[PDB]
């Protein structure tokens, strides 16, 4: 009769309009809960050292669980055992950076290439200014950027990761599903560092840029990012 | 129907309102406003009657058309922009005109037009510069002001008045409004010492003058 079939199509248009509304209340609430949990996780790593200075003991904080690994040296003249590693962290060009969670089985791997990297331990801000700005996806062996939540929610719906701020809570605090959001992130494309490195070859101890630098790596992401 | 009330929240930054949608719900009072529920044209003939058609079909197509183009969002025609100033320019200041055939005369500012350009009127007895539009970019601001708020500027003069039409001859209304403004402006600048020869002389560089050194 073509009187009812109109209204039946309008029911499907209204049910999804309500489904976008009940997904835009959810991402806002999953973000506010995290904004509370980051205050609580920063202040409580101060409070144990103020109570440990009232008595006179010391509070050693736990060793961190996340490192940020940048390659600085070239493709030419490379040791074969090295180049396998730098192709097991997916660092193919120069100036590529990744996020690596830490354990005993990956410190000794990041020890053998100390002359080629400069790794650290990143702050909370320099994870935002790497996901929001230089953060591209990996959809079907391609490289598709991130302009919506639905580009994440296709390839990560099986882990209750439905936005960007859940992927950030996962990386900052390393959740169970870290592998399925770090093989997904394409390797980053940083630029040349402004101002200038000191000297590429040597260690950061004797005035270089390689080797460990535990919280000076945010002075190399605010410079390069 | 119903009067158009002003927008309830104010503006905090460009884009961001100062009230959220919760204090705005109760501010709007959305607790008590629930809501629940041509081409054919005939004509006579003085046979029969004839039915004409509006906007009739063409008589000649070209051999090839060009396609439609896409839609952006933030592109306005020129008459719908925003208008800006600098910081230093006020009505009553003294300017240094640069690029006309009035090269380098020290002149006096009046106002900002609706199109952007300035209303720069020298006293015609001094600098031979009448009411004349110039542009804001090409004008160096000399920090030397006079009072202006005791004038009665006419309301018919605008960009439609200075705008080109097509030898030449001067219309008598240019001579009128030039004399009418100058007979009110001129006693203000005459009563300041050493100014009627200042507006008069020209700016020029010389050896031992660098523009980044003197402040003006």
């Amino acid at each position: 009769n073509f009187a009812e079939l109109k209204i039946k199509r309008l029911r499907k248009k209204f049910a999804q309009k309500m489904l976008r509304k009940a997904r835009r209340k959810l991402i806002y609430e999953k973000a506010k809960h995290y904004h509370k949990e980051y205050r609580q996780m920063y202040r409580t790593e101060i409070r144990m050292a103020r109570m440990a200075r009232k008595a006179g003991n010391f509070y050693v904080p736990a060793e961190p669980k996340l490192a940020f690994v940048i390659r600085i040296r070239g493709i030419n003249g490379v040791s074969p055992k090295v180049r396998k590693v730098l192709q097991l962290l997916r660092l193919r060009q120069i100036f590529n950076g990744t996020f690596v969670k830490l354990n005993k089985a990956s410190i000794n791997m990041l020890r053998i290439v100390e002359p080629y990297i400069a790794w650290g331990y990143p702050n909370l801000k320099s994870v935002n200014e790497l996901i929001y700005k230089r953060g591209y996806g990996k959809i079907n062996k391609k490289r598709i950027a991130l302009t919506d939540n639905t580009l994440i929610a296709r390839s990560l719906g099986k882990y209750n990761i439905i936005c960007m701020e859940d992927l950030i809570h996962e990386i900052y605090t390393v959740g169970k599903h870290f592998k399925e959001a770090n093989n997904f992130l394409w390797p980053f494309k940083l630029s040349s560092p402004r101002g200038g490195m000191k000297k590429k070859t040597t260690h950061f101890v004797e005035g270089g840029d390689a080797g460990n630098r535990e919280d000076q790596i945010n002075r190399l992401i605010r410079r390069m990012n | 129907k119903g009067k158009p009330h002003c927008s309830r929240n104010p503006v905090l930054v460009r884009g961001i309102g100062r009230y959220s949608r919760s204090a705005m719900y109760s501010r709007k009072a959305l607790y008590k406003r629930k809501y629940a529920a041509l081409a054919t044209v005939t004509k006579p003939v003085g046979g029969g009657t004839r039915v004409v058609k509006l906007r009739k079909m063409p008589r000649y197509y070209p051999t090839e058309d060009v396609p439609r183009k896409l839609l952006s969002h933030g592109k306005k025609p020129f008459s719908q922009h925003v208008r800006k100033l600098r910081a230093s320019i006020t009505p009553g200041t003294i300017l240094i005109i640069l690029t006309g055939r009035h090269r380098g005369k020290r002149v006096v500012f009046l106002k900002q037009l609706s199109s952007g350009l300035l209303l720069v009127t020298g006293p015609l007895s001094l600098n031979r510069v009448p009411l004349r539009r110039t542009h804001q970019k090409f004008v160096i601001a000399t920090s030397t002001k006079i009072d202006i708020s005791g004038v009665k500027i006419p309301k018919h003069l605008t960009d439609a008045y200075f705008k080109k039409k097509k030898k030449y001859e001067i219309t008598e209304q240019r001579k009128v409004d030039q004399k009418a403004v100058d007979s009110q402006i001129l006693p203000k600048i005459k009563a300041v010492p050493q100014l009627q020869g200042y507006l008069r002389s020209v700016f020029a560089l010389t050896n031992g003058v660098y523009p980044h050194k003197l402040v003006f």
Binding site: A15, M18, L19, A22, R23, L26 | K34, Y35, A36
Partner: peptide, 19 residues
């Protein structure tokens, strides 16, 4: 309320409180 299979009645009763 999120996934469309279960909370359809919840958005139903919200449609029969919003008017």
């Amino acid at each position: 309320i999120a996934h469309p299979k279960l909370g359809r009645r919840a958005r139903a009763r919200i449609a029969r409180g919003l008017r």
